[PDB]
Amino acid sequence: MPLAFCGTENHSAAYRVDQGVLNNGCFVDALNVVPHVFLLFITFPILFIGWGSTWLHFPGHNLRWILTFILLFVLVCEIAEGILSDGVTESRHLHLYMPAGMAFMAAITSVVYYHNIETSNFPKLLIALLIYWTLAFITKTIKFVKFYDHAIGFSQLRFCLTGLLVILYGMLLLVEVNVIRVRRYIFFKTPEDLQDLGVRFLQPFVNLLSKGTYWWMNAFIKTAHKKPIDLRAIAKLPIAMRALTNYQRLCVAFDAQARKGARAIWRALCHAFGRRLILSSTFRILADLLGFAGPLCIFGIVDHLGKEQPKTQFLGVYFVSSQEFLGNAYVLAVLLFLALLLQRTFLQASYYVAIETGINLRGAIQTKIYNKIMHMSTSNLSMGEMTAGQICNLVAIDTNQLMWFFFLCPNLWTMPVQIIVGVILLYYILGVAAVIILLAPVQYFVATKLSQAQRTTLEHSNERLKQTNEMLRGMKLLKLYAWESIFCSRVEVTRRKEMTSLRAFAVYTSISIFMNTAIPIAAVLITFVGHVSFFKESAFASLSLFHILVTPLFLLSSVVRSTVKALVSVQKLSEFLSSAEIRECVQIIGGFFTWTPDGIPTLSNITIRIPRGQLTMIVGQVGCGKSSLLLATLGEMQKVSGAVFWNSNRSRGPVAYASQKPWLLNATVEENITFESPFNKQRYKMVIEACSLQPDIDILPHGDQTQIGERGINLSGGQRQRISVARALYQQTNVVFLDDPFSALDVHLSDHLMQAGILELLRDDKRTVVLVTHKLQYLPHADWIIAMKDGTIQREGTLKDFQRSECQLFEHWQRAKIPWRACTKYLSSAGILLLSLLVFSQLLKHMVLVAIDYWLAKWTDSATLLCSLGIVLCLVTSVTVEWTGLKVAKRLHRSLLNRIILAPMRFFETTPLGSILNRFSSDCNTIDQHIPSTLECLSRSTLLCVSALTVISYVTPVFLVALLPLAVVCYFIQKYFRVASRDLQQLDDTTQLPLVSHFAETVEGLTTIRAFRYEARFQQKLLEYTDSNNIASLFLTAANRWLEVCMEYIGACVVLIAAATSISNSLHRELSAGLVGLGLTYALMVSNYLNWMVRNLADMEIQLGAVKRIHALLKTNWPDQGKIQIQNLSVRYDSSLKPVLKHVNTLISPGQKIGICGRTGSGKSSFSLAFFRMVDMFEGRIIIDGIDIAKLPLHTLRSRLSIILQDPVLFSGTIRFNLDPEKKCSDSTLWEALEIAQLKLVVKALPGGLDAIITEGGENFSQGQRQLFCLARAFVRKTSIFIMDEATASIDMATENILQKVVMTAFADRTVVTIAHRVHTILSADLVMVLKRGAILEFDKPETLLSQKDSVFASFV
């Protein structure tokens, strides 16, 4: 029984070459063999030469790929047909399936060949492929015309298949010769060079296999596991994705639409992105339809295999009828497999095209927003209407969610089509669905109530977090007076109010999961119960349809919510976009200028001229239009009437300017000094000298490298005014405007040195200046002054004019992860009595869903109360999850508060408040309102997945042999993808932060930037920020889609193997395919349960990482003697190299209020810190009124001994709560204190009295009211001693009032120990001690020994 080529029968009569060679119907297949094996036998060594930087794709090549692939599809179909025809027959006969296998391999090799000839630019070498393609087109055309001569027609299948690849090969031969015409290589006598030089990200210019499967990502992601992904490793982002380019295209769209509001933005967005958005929607519709084809193949397979030879015979050859073709079993399985392997590639492509269009929308619209910042007026009507928070929330939230809307925009095209086709094929499947079509509005109303509760919850917990910030800012002051507990109680009360709100949030979000996971069960139950009781007419395919319908509905509910937010956002930006713009030597003639663009000119009759070569000191009344006139010269006022001659020694030059309000960019201080200018040491040193900035630089621990301004080193107002003057002065300009720099700079000697340096700089540059201020010490002397009285110019001339206008009278006046810490979370959070119930209910629910699936299979074979148990268990699990997360967050919150209470003040000195507040608030929010739902979703998704692989292994008990490599591959793919995705996620966050940082620093100092006309550099910084955000966003997106392709093909192979082994055991061993079919419907859902599994697993990784930060914060009658004799108590902090206090055996006598101030460099502050027993006094002996002060409860010791401070602060609350909240002793003591200290005329003038709100520090009480509250605590806490510190900045009368209050404290308490680096006012005392260079050097029990000795008087001089 050997291998006959055509067939052995009739004594070699099929080998009869008589009656023509071509009229033999088997010999033509042998003719069709020739071109395919010819191309193989001429192109394998070539390919091996191939096997042994610059790319150019050939012209007209997309149709090559689609014709080659669709010919792969029909050639696989002819492989199936050849096997099905040669197998049920008596012979072998081997002429049905020898040509197709080499043809399949030939198509594979000719596309590898076309790829290897596209990689290497050598166009004269595709002559072989084209002469091949023409030869095979001719040969199958001959076969088809002889099939036509035998008059077969379309009834038999092989006629149709042959005609299909005839027109296939003809049309793709025509593609080849169109390329021949274009590139003109063979018979003609006679590129992406821009796309060459650039970026790493070559996904839009790569072959189709890498466009589909993200093959180029592979070498990236495998590179990413060894070394991390720096920003330099990220691409340069090519021209087609440059934000400027999309912005130009969009502005052309704007101009075309606006030549021919909300509809304008709508039309503009549609015109700029519809040809891709529509392409994305088209791919999405095709993916929906090929998803919706699946169940037809499963139903057909099970019906024909339950059906338990072909009729036609033309010329002795058996042709399979087409109904029997599409009625076959194995053929439909292979078709199902190839349909899934193409469906689940178009879905990812649709995702990606929507994402790419979204990133270009974000780019162009952010660029447009910033361009219309660059022309927006900074008025008190323009900026006075809309603050910077409005425009910051606009940019951030609006543009990101408009992007998320154009993410969800094809969904609003498909989920309706999804629902309609679901209803249609559910009627074809089950005969004569409203429940499942009623589960998207359930999600809509539940999400609506959830978002309302979340809004209210967030704006309540915002007040809770603000109170916590106000209770964590004064940590040292409240711990010093032992006043932590009352603020902890007011926090725990606000926390429990927020906890009631969070319980309502969790209820309304448990019900979404419950409705989400119990609507299909009731839908199927009502469906089949109708089918039996109400219908009585006649399954697993229907269940799979139930899955395919269930998935879009909740997404569509979110789409509708996003649509509403998008419409509101476009309304917001349209009402924003039509606000007032700005506009289109010195001389101003007509004089009318206002802010509102009509009516009430705010500055009129202005006829003032200031030509070049000048130094104008200006003067005027208080707010008489000085900054208004300066900005009006700058062209920043709506000038109604007048003209502006303008000539720099008609275009404007770089006028330096400095507004009344200072401004500093959140950058380095030298970067905030140089301001995008080259750096020379001389002028920089001169400006640091003139503005006295070298002591200011030394006042900072980095100086010219510290992150100045907001989000960094907190500066002072005089420092910021001086920094602004330095940045204004350095920029090397032909004019200089100084609008009162020494107004806020109250340092007179600094101001005088600055005035002299200003004269020197403006005198040594020979450039015009204009200084508008009230410093009249020099302004009427040697300036060309100009005075604006009542908003008008009086005289711009010499000093004799001010001696002629009654103005001198005023001048005469790695990568480790969760499970240890995650185990600690679940253990310390839950308690096993609810964790066990949660895991048991989840496992039981999934066992019930498996069981009801098997019961559905058996009843369908033979042609309820488990779906009810399922719904109840789903409700139970959703309740248990939300309840467990709520209790978890509650007890963790109280734990965080308790560990923050039991802390030393040295940690607050060490660690910033930002770390404690950040890992408090953001991680508490994450482990309170975001982590439990994701945990529940993971615990439902991976358990559905483990269930599904259990079902596949149960149906086909041979599957597990193929499970082990699939799980190994999934484990390795999970590992390498996790390694890339975590780092890329952090790179996304740390790149999306500086763009909105730029929008803050732009919106703050806008008029200075628009004053310099130095917009293009910030334009480049904006475009750089937008590019650095977009490249990370596109790589994160494309990594997600590549993940989904790789894991989803792993799942597809699982489906194929499971179905194959189940069908193999059901053809012969008769597996009773219901157990097999129920396996298959989990095999289809595996394909996306893995999807949900992988994406949610990454999210579970990142959020449990901030629990790590949580673990890090979990890791760490009245004494009236005053006779505490310290006996040699030596102090240390790290006990490393330098103790400060040494051997100080010093006593404060009763009455002898020893105010002991010393040397401020070495021994002043350390003793002042160590005075409250709040530091490590490493030796000696410290008695306190004869008691042991080294082993006492420090809460009781620090409660009843008041002090004063250097930088005092008032805790906000009731006035009795601001005085003594824990005590609340008596009203008359508070009247005596708050009368006799200070602020009696504010307390009695307060609206409430002792029960009035301390308005966040006493915002309009006094500044001496802080010291008054200190004295209140001194009079209230039975405090004989009162340790006082000096005022940092105060008035001399304020220091005298503090001294008078200290005199009253001496008259009433008489115990005090004060240190003051202001030694010349610290002389009113009783005893003193000077402890210089860390010793007991001087002690003066009379006050005259300080004034008697040399050095103490030298410190007193």
Residue numbers in the entry: 1 to 52, 63 to 200, 207 to 276, 283 to 330, 335 to 458, 464 to 569, 576 to 621, 678 to 742, ...
Provide the authors' own sentences about this structure as they appear in the paper:
Interestingly, the dominant class emerging from 3D classification for the ATP-only state as well as the apo state presented a similar conformation, with Kir6.2 tetramer closed and SUR1 inward-facing. By contrast, the KNt cryoEM density is absent in the apo structure, suggesting that when no ATP is bound to Kir6.2, KNt has little residence time in the ABC core central cavity.
Uniquely, the sulfonylurea receptors SUR1 and SUR2 lack transport activity per se but instead are devoted to forming the ATP-sensitive potassium (KATP) channels, wherein four SUR.x subunits form a complex with four subunits of an inwardly rectifying potassium channel, Kir6.1 or Kir6.2. KATP channels are gated by intracellular ATP and ADP, key features which enable them to regulate membrane excitability according to the energetic state of the cell.
